[PDB]
Write a protein that binds this ligand. Structure first.
Ligand code: HEM
Ligand code: HEM
Ligand SMILES: Nc1ncnc2c1ncn2[C@@H]1O[C@H](COP(=O)(O)OP(=O)(O)O)[C@@H](O)[C@H]1O
Ligand SMILES: [Cl-]
Ligand SMILES: [Cl-]
Ligand code: NA
Ligand code: NA
Lengths: 713, 713
């Protein structure tokens, strides 16, 4: 059946904004996963998981009699899709169980691992999400094998459909680089926002770059991809060597024996895939990656034998039974156990990417330290494993259960506790009047609060106005935030704050974070009053102010808006059309298409554009909250044409006289072009719509201001 | 950006079930369009539309100074996509303003027509939908040009995103027959459910079949496509000749001058398309279809000139200025006015498909009768226009406003008015006890009610349990309804009915329609009791019983389920996989995926399968309402394989012994295979889910029983 996407493959896709509707969710509209989790007997879940580790099923027999290695790989791949560029991927939504991730070649046979967990999922039901269970299972695996984890938090609610993520443009699984849809350009520069080297891989190719078995070159790809997953050198080495303390790879025969991935398999496979015609198809005969390596002499027990072997042997290039490149220890004795036959032993083996840990010079220093000091290794691995598996969970207020680590980690973007009474409704009214009496304008107040709150992204729940990180490096200097203008606003608000706080009794005070938001609220109320409408914008206090020392400047870089269509802002010229970047930002904000449309049209007329640009400001009463953006955009009396100077800027002229009325960008005019967006614009540009536009604008503004308020959930 | 549909282009698409969420709808969740419409000043709207008729805009100047022909075409196209096979298409959702229909070649320049209406739409806002406005406009165009319409009803709520309709499989607009994705096979047999001859046409090709200008052959295509739009020969001749009493076609120069359709155009085009480089690109120079025909001597006034011209001249084949085949009157004088230049006149001209009305022998007899009795023509056209524009609106209870025709038409599937007291809760309890005491089983009660209610489709709001048409021809004889079993259940219910009704005073009586549904409710209650659960199922009385003479047996044929996954029924072997047909049915029933899931699993254990098939009956307690379907389907202790006899039937055997435990179809097993469906099945097959399953099942059952209850809306 031919679809709209077939006829118009480059038209903008709004379906991404309308995922996760109540229609697709089997749980009631009142279901609260945190409340269910908080009553889970977590210790009981863990006991059942511990038992499972050594209860082999004959349909996928346990290597060494222990499923721990398999489950650790499972949890690492669940988390391993994360990209810092956009926060997408990660373990936080349990997306491994849906397409495409359930059928990526790097996730081969994890379908088996998830199926092993159905009896426990079934027993506990809604009180433990798949998303939490995948991670918990990896932690129990670790514990069962003698490794002390750093802790665990629940709270990852399940999702019910695939997320729309850009994983690359290749049309062939695992395509090598340099194809017509190459994700690499220049000197091996990987395109943002990607964080894997080949389509369908987690991070890197275990044979080496595009299959070339050079550990030094592979190290480059490890370092780049791991950094794009928010891991530094120490963390990277700790993770890889920690993981590869356990279990084995699977490559017992040729890969041509392996059948269709789950999404392609027949209905009778019941959601499993990669059925193998090689011998028994499983166990001793398993084929997963095609490699056949077993790293340590005790694959079912924590040890420091990975680095003992890495450094204690010289390594020879060899081939697995499937033909993949891998390495074997020269001259070694057969000291590695076989997974099924207690009479067989094997020489030590390694992946190309394992040898990167010794042959890259910066890795080698860390790896040596960890070899000489395994307690340092263990602690780094524990810390890195917690980070890996929690990096997309959001603020610590979302962490549930009895095993949450008390230590506050800098990567969590922590917010200090509030230890004083909060402002009440009368205080809020007093502050809004003081802010308006200062002389700050509607535009300055709206723009400041927008800048502070719109850093949120729902992908990894980072950003937002909590913390008042807008006053700190690097936010205070981002171009989109208008550094000089911002500094002036912040100085004014800080003076109002000082004055109010100095007047109080009983310890009541207002944080700068709360006052930035409140001041934006006052701006929107004032703009409504400028239009003739008396409205109260909701405000919820309780944000706190973070310090510079609590703020990782390098980690915060990925949150810089380089494209913010809500402020008509593009930092440079991109391949992707600006309207596509608008919808991407709207999705990060968690906005629907109606929400996106009302918000943008209101921001344009409040003066929120960076640089005071007139593009899209289709009103003669700027700083009044009206629907003028939509009424003027939709006026057929105006004709639009791209400018000669810039194809991305348009002039709107009166059709009869030629008189210049307006200018606009692609982000402004998509609302009058796209057939779905134009239908939304029409509602708000109708003669009956002024009350509705104000009400809906206020509601979406409040939604944005509150995106990171998990303290109120 | 590669998507899941790219990787797995034949996996089932559940997005069709989660359209029309509250996320994409800009109106509040409590918006009620009927209440808005009922307060519209419809008379005011009609005055504005009358004014618009002759208010020419320079960007698309009005032919003859009157937009009435353009608007008639616009409304006839809005309606003209309707297909009786599935009820999809039609005017009722205003879908002409969205992709793909806004850009079909046959809808060229209707973008202009819609844009002329924006000022009126803006003025009246939410109180008139686009969907109602398009039809109202057509009516006013006819009235303006001297034709008295049969009536008009409002109530077509707007929609906010495209419907997922199968329009065909061709990948080329307008492709002629016999290609790789041909919609024709055999003896020019058009594939169900399509009702057009070429991709992007409304019904037929105006040059003739595949472009061949044979009026007799064209008439075969006219007859078939119009029958697939619910129109008979009389209706067809009346509509074509009535439409073509007005206006003209547009083909002033070669089609290669015409640019991108709306969804392909540049952002500056602001939602319009088909910009033409030919001369002024509009008005006298317009190119729409490529034909250049004006049918009557008064194109802006109702006349009897269409049939005068058709019969009064002999016709010669010629070409338009764009090269399209059309006909010109031999020897005629230049009597047809020019649309723009009072000094030019033209000879009478006709399309191939107009000549079909004279050269097909059955049409010729009707055409002659209309030529000799123009009052008959006028009345037939008025009735056909009303049908055309209301065919998809559903029961008359949904018709709004002061111009609704009082006359009840057979095609409306009319339900008699209720003129007696209805049964109350105490009476319902008495009837349910009588039904359970009669010996009817859970299976018989559930299956009967299911058969009665599940004929509803939301596409055209036809079907459902109101009317008790299950007792009439042809529903009573449909294979899926199990005619012999049905007759025995109906005879028992009719005896209960008669006994109850004869005992009442004051006029109270229960309809058979209500009793069917109530007895199904008693079946579900009894099944829940059989499972240990104490459940009351909601019931709303007020259905009435329609007569056989109120039930057009040929129009009812399209409602026959040839595939009904809910009863594991397939009438024959089809090219479309059964699970796609299940999703199709769910969409017609208005079900989400969770609703489809719970419903199907419950129906399987209640004994609703046709023929008492064991396929998917995964329980040892049939006729008890439990979640057994899910718990057993998901048990990894069972392995599934297709049977040797039939690749579409599967056997589930114990993995350890080989012993046969169950059999199932594709519709049963897709719930254990599709990664989204299986995530839903998991919820209902969890240990905590029995009460959730029962409650959800009751809710969805109640939903289905009330789908046609627009008397209660
Ligand atoms: C450069 C990064 C990495 C590469 C290229 C990589 C590669 C692979 C490959 C090819 C396999 C074999 C799959 C199979 O055939 O069964 C595997 C297994 C495994 N990986 Fe990694 N890995 C990486 C990092 C990690 C990390 C960060 C962890 C966890 C902290 C991890 C834990 C494991 C474990 C436990 C197994 C064994 C699975 C079993 O016993 O079934 N790996 N690795
Ligand atoms: C066999 C069925 C039919 C065929 C093949 C057909 C074909 C067409 C074509 C090709 C045009 C010219 C488009 C353009 O170049 O502007 C047209 C115009 C039009 N049709 Fe039809 N038609 C059919 C039935 C109808 C019916 C059922 C109605 C309404 C009751 C209708 C009303 C009109 C009107 C009013 C115009 C004039 C448009 C204008 O003045 O701008 N047609 N038809
Ligand atoms: N309209 C009704 N008439 C009679 N009983 C009802 C009605 N609606 C709900 N109930 C009963 O109340 C129970 C729970 O009510 P509710 O909270 O509305 O959720 P649901 O959408 O599951 O019906 C139902 O399972 C049914 O037995
Ligand atoms: Cl994601
Ligand atoms: Cl439709
Ligand atoms: Na994420
Ligand atoms: Na329809």
């Amino acid at each position: 059946g031919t679809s709209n996407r077939d006829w118009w493959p480059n038209q903008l896709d709004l379906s991404i904004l309308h995922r996760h509707s109540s229609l697709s969710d089997p749980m009631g509209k009142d279901f609260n996963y945190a409340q269910a989790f908080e009553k889970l007997d977590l210790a009981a879940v863990k006991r059942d998981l511990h038992a499972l580790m050594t209860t082999s099923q004959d349909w996928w027999p346990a290597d060494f009699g222990h499923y721990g290695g398999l489950f650790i790989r499972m949890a690492w791949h669940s988390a391993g899709t994360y990209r810092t560029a956009d926060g997408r991927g990660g373990a936080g939504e349990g997306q491994q169980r849906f397409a495409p991730l359930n059928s990526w070649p790097d996730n081969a046979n994890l379908d088996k691992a998830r199926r092993l967990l159905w009896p426990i999922k079934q027993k506990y039901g809604r009180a433990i999400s798949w998303a939490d269970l995948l991670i918990l299972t990896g932690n129990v695996a670790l514990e069962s094998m003698g490794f002390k984890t750093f802790g665990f938090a629940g709270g990852r609610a399940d999702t019910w459909e695939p997320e729309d993520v850009y994983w690359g443009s290749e049309k062939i699984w695992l395509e090598l680089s340099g194809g017509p849809n190459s994700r690499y350009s220049g000197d091996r520069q990987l395109e943002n926002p990607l964080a894997a080297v080949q389509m369908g891989l987690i991070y890197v190719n275990p044979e080496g770059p595009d299959g070339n078995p050079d550990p030094v070159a592979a190290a480059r790809d490890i370092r780049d991809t791991f950094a794009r997953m928010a891991m530094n050198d120490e963390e990277t080495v700790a993770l890889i060597a920690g993981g590869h303390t356990f279990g084995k790879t699977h490559g017992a025969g040729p890969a041509s024996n392996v059948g269709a991935e789950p999404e392609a398999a027949g209905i009778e496979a019941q959601g499993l895939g990669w059925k193998s015609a090689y011998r028994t198809g499983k166990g001793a005969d398993a084929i997963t990656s095609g490699l056949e390596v077993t790293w340590t002499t005790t694959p079912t027990q924590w040890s420091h034998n990975f680095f003992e072997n890495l450094f204690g042997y010289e390594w020879e290039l060899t081939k697995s039974p499937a033909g993949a490149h891998q390495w074997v220890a020269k001259g070694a004795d057969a000291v590695i156990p076989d997974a099924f036959d207690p009479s067989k032993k094997h020489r030590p083996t390694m992946l190309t990417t394992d040898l990167s840990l010794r042959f890259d010079p910066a890795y080698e220093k860390i790896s040596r330290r960890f070899h000489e000091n395994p307690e340092q290794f263990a602690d780094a691995f524990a810390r890195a494993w917690f980070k890996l598996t929690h990096r997309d969970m959001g603020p610590r207020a979302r962490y549930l259960g009895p095993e949450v680590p008390a230590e506050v980690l800098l990567w969590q973007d922590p917010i200090p506790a509030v230890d004083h009474p909060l402002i009440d409704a009368a205080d809020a009214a007093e502050l809004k009047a003081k802010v308006l009496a200062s002389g700050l304008t509607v535009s300055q107040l709206v723009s400041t609060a927008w800048a502070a709150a719109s850093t949120f992204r729902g992908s990894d729940k980072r950003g937002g106005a909590n913390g008042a990180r807008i006053r700190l490096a690097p936010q205070k200097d981002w171009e989109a935030n208008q550094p000089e203008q911002l500094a002036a606003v912040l100085e004014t608000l800080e003076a109002i704050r000082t004055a109010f706080n100095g007047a109080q009794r009983g310890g009541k005070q207002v944080s700068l974070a709360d006052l930035i938001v409140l001041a934006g609220c006052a701006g929107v109320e004032q703009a409504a009053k400028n239009a003739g409408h008396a409205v109260t914008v909701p405000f919820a206090p309780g944000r706190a102010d973070a310090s510079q020392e609590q703020t990782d400047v390098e980690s915060m870089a990925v949150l810089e808006p380089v494209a913010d269509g809500f402020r008509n802002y593009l930092k440079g010229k991109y391949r992707v059309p600006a309207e596509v970047l608008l919808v991407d930002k709207a999705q990060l904000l968690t906005l629907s298409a109606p929400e996106m449309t009302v918000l943008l049209g209101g921001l344009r007329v409040l003066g929120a554009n960076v640089g005071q640009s007139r593009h899209g400001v289709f009103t003669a009463r700027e700083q009044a909250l009206t629907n003028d953006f939509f009424v003027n955009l939709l006026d057929m009396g105006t004709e639009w044409k791209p400018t000669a100077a810039d194809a991305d800027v348009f002039e709107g002229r009166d059709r009869a006289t030629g008189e210049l009325k307006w200018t606009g960008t692609r982000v402004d005019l998509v609302f009058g072009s796209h057939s779905q967006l134009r239908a939304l614009a029409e509602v708000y540009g109708s003669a009956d719509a002024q009350e509705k536009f104000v009400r809906d604008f206020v509601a979406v503004w409040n939604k944005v201001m509150n995106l990171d308020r998990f303290d109120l959930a």
